[PDB]
């Protein structure tokens, strides 16, 4: 087939791998700062749930 086969095929392949390359680098730093800061959708380590706490009046007044 003509060179427009390989020319446009390379255009598609090179572009697609280019987006993957930048996304891979973006993922490395996004995970890096998300793990450090923790203010992100993931890497949220579990903590104690606040619905377990009982608020009813106890024996001693001051608690």
């Amino acid at each position: 087939d003509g060179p427009e086969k390989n020319y446009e095929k390379t255009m598609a392949i090179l572009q697609i791998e280019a987006e993957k390359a930048e996304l891979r680098l973006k993922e490395l730093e996004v995970r890096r700062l998300m793990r450090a800061r923790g203010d992100g959708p993931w890497y949220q380590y579990p903590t104690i749930d606040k619905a377990l706490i009982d608020h009813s009046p106890k024996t001693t007044p001051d608690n």
Binding site: I16, E19, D39
Partner: protein
């Protein structure tokens, strides 16, 4: 003019009309932390598949 309260009468829960205001912060709680960014938005197929090494899809 005193009558001995019957059994369990002294153990009832009573109501009073104290005119002091309700303490807004009885525990003197500090400012509550801001919630983490809420998880929302629509889900679309992962861009360029797994994006891990030679796995195109």
């Amino acid at each position: 003019g005193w009558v001995r309260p019957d059994l369990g009468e002294l153990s009832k829960v009573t109501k009073v009309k104290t005119d002091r205001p309700l303490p807004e912060n009885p525990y003197h709680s500090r400012a509550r932390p801001e919630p983490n960014p809420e998880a929302e938005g629509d889900l679309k197929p992962a861009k360029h598949g797994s994006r891990l090494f030679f796995w195109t899809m």
